[PDB]
Symmetry: D2
Subunit: 239 residues, 4 copies
């Protein structure tokens, strides 16, 4: 019948555009009280409570948590989705290129969870989901630093899963393959084709498809015994 | 809102008791036209179309397919769930102990899919799910033969996934941890405790919990881009 | 300095040609007393003790064990390498095509280990290695049955590893990518190229390269704490 | 006969004590010209060329590279082994606790490879190995940050493997289980026992055992086709 997500308060980092917006949108049409953090809050999602925050700044995220708790109530769900790339071959990557992705994609994830966690423990309820990636698990050329971080979140989620279990709090990861967002839609046609040919399903995925995987893991009904897991959504691109 | 499973015809092997019954029951309350095969069809599930069949016999399964197609219509979903154990330490296992699990758990799975596959290809639609196991992925003492087969189904599903993609047909696997069925509820209390202590979640899983994972993979709406994947439901017992 | 393999008795199934011959050859030049079983024993390896045996027949393998124990002494190492293919798309595969690969590749592996295991336990020493495959882990089109079995051996080895640990007996698996044997050297040039382009290393592997991985796992010196592991040799084809 | 490591120049980060010292020691007795970087260089390894350097400082590592190249010649091998812990439960971990492990264990690894990589590419030869961990792959309680980084190095190595293949340069990872170093030998007896009971092999591993796995991956002879792989050395603790 129903996923136990009605009136549940959920925070999505990076939820203004792209995959994050898609997660926000779907959770809304499941009856959740969704909030999102980002650098801009346009959206155009009206009913969503956008909060300008920066995952690399812990004060910024703790403030957003306070604002969200105050307006919507105690938080059940967190989707750590905000991430960036600084793509280049290993010897062309500067310390700045490492500092940037490590801050948003690794540190920023923990800073996105840290302001909601103690409360989740008190309420003995909560579902945490980090995003990504096929590059994190398989590896990717030019993404030696992106990959380190997307493989890093999987390790963070597995340990967090083992810590949170005594409170009935779950942590999992979704590892998307190549997904049609505005970013990947601007990549050269000849590169899109080379990649699409690697995918047995013969297409990139859609954002609403990642949203569904996140929803499944957030549902206290559909995945109550799922924790520490990586859910691959890649059309058999990586198996 | 809804998983695209209303009026969808789904076959569950081993669906009279245990986990299979739970999968049957939940698919029913999602509006699916569910059928099951087994050695007995009591159930007591009335509205479910029980067909006496044997996964080790291909004539038996092709007959059941014919009966099911005829009564309910063209098949969308298949859950290859029927499996057995012949547990013993490696040197105490007889050829009969190998023949038995290999037939039901490996061969029987392919024989459960073979009578529905050509039609799924014609209709360019279908979602296949094999079950198990934590023992298949981690290994288990006394289950050297059970494990070979539950690891074998994962390989079967990954290859089938890659073959079926050109028809929009998906294949995945669910790998349950230790689940409270009537079989595991009769295992010695001191062994149940030794195992339960290994599980961060501090309990065995429930059958309706495996049912939900199977439903997620069958949904053409919730997992349209999920294929070739293993979904672990183990409470972080194996991560 | 040296791998503790001098004067060690090692049995290699399928060791007359191909990868098996390569494993036999290298173990010999490490000072091991190597024997092999196969359907033919030409070899042309002279110093190797070829025994005509069939992995699908347990009497046949137990006889070979007796012969080998008698001529060379108590067995330390076993390489379960004999395997076959019956390649076809899932709906074109006959029960005979399933029975064949399941017997040689799954059952035949256990039947290759069963006649040496009780003695290894007595001597509290031994290293077991099964072969394969990239198809077992990734999946492969047209190899839905080969893959089920090569994924099956990994599960068998992980469980056997957990059982054999109390005797200091180790079990592991080597998962080769595409390897230049006489079989793969007869595959069409256009298919060889399509595959070779998938491999970052830009070549198929060589048999002496699989031999080295097997040697590493057999060495009681180099891998004394390695058990339950899969060693991939694929040139980053599957990561 | 021999691993192609005689007269090969190899750098080991964190090689003064513990596992690093063990790797240094074994490579030496394989005829390699080994150097190590660390915060102290006592050792007491005399013949090893200790260089005081800090993996978190890129100038410091590029200087060490220059010194090592100048004294020993062009570098073939790099073992990124230096790592630290700041163990605590997720909500007790400060930004400083994240910054520390992320710098040494993730960033520090890339900074250990960056000064040798361009030359390896020129010479079309090289083998890179990062360390760890069982916590990186499985997850561990109290190590939510250590784990993120040890899972991160695996992703870094897989991407680096795919980039370096066009130059015949290999990258792999060794994932040790619990190893008897001076650090783990000071952990409480009751915790050592709780952990040792989880290990089928019934003991922690030894440093010379990790050294052997690193040697295998560095050998241009024994692992010429091994790249992008994780080699687990855990006594079946994690399978």
């Amino acid at each position: 019948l129903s996923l136990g997500l009605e009136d549940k308060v959920i925070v999505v980092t990076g939820g203004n555009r792209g995959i994050g917006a898609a997660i926000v949108k779907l959770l809304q049409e499941m009856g959740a009280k969704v909030a999102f953090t980002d650098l801009a809050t346009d959206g155009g999602n009206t009913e969503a409570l956008g909060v300008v925050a920066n995952v690399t700044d812990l004060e910024s995220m703790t403030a957003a948590a306070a604002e969200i708790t105050d307006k919507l109530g105690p938080v059940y769900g967190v989707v750590a989705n905000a991430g960036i790339t600084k793509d280049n071959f290993f010897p062309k990557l500067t310390p700045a290129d490492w500092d940037a992705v490590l801050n948003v994609n690794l540190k920023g994830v923990a800073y996105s969870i840290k302001p909601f966690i103690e409360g989740m423990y008190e309420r003995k309820a909560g579902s945490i989901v980090a995003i990504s990636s096929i590059s994190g698990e398989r590896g990717n050329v030019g993404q030696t630093n992106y990959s380190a971080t997307k493989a890093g979140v999987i390790g963070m989620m597995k340990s967090l899963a083992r810590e949170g279990a005594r409170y009935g709090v779950r942590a999992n990861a979704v590892a998307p393959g190549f997904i049609d967002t505005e970013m990947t839609l601007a990549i050269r046609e000849d590169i899109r084709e080379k990649i699409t040919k690697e995918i047995p399903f013969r297409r990139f995925g859609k954002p609403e498809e990642i949203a569904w995987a996140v929803a499944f893991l957030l549902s206290p009904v559909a995945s109550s015994y799922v924790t520490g897991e990586v859910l691959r959504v890649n059309g058999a691109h990586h198996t």
